[PDB]
Amino acid sequence: AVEELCNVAESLIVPVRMGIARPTAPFTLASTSIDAMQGSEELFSVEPLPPRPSS
Amino acid sequence: AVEELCNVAESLIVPVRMGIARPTAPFTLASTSIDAMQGSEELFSVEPLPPRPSS
């Protein structure tokens, strides 16, 4: 778990220290877990892109 | 001259590739030599900070 967390942290920090961060508008932070569940629900409960029908 | 230009270029490019560039506002580019002489004149015709009088 510690090794995987190290890799995740490196993935998150590389664009910041290479100056290639993609601009994003500011957002507020949820003060309750019921709001934090949403947003994450939209992000994760998604389906892959379906294949092209026929050919 | 080539070596000094290399050092100047490195000085100019380090903040960009370390993600520490100081935000600035957009500006137009002069199309005349006199305008380019201006601005540069304000930049280079300055004086060093004088010492504190007495003690």
UniProtKB/Swiss-Prot annotation, chains A, B:
Subcellular location: Nucleus; Cytoplasm
Modified residue annotations for Phosphoserine: 11
Domain of life: Eukaryota
Tissue-by-tissue expression: Widely expressed. Most abundant in testis and expressed at high levels in brain, pituitary and kidney.
Protein purpose: E3 ubiquitin-protein ligase involved in different protein quality control pathways in the cytoplasm and nucleus. Mainly acts as a ubiquitin chain elongator that extends pre-ubiquitinated substrates. Component of the N-end rule pathway: ubiquitinates proteins bearing specific N-terminal residues that are destabilizing according to the N-end rule, leading to their degradation. Recognizes type-1 N-degrons, containing positively charged amino acids (Arg, Lys and His).
Quaternary structure and interacting proteins, as annotated: Homotetramer; composed of a dimer of dimers. Associates with CDK9 and TFIIS/TCEA1 and forms a transcription regulatory complex made of CDK9, RNAP II, UBR5 and TFIIS/TCEA1 that can stimulate target gene transcription (e.g. gamma fibrinogen/FGG) by recruiting their promoters. Associates with the E3 ligase complex containing DYRK2, EDD/UBR5, DDB1 and DCAF1 proteins (EDVP complex). Binds TOPBP1. Interacts with PIH1D1. Interacts with CIB1. (Microbial infection) Interacts with human T-cell leukemia virus 1/HTLV-1 protein HBZ; this interaction modulates HBZ stability.
Family: Belongs to the UBR5 family.
Comment on protein domains: The UBR-type zinc finger forms a pocket that mediates recognition of type 1 N-degrons. The UBA domain recognizes and binds ubiquitin. It acts as an ubiquitin acceptor required to place 'Lys-48' of ubiquitin into the HECT domain activie site, thereby potentiating the E3 ubiquitin-protein ligase activity.
Name of the protein in question: E3 ubiquitin-protein ligase UBR5
Origin organism lineage: Eukaryota, Metazoa, Chordata, Craniata, Vertebrata
Whole-protein coverage range: 1471 to 1525 of 2799
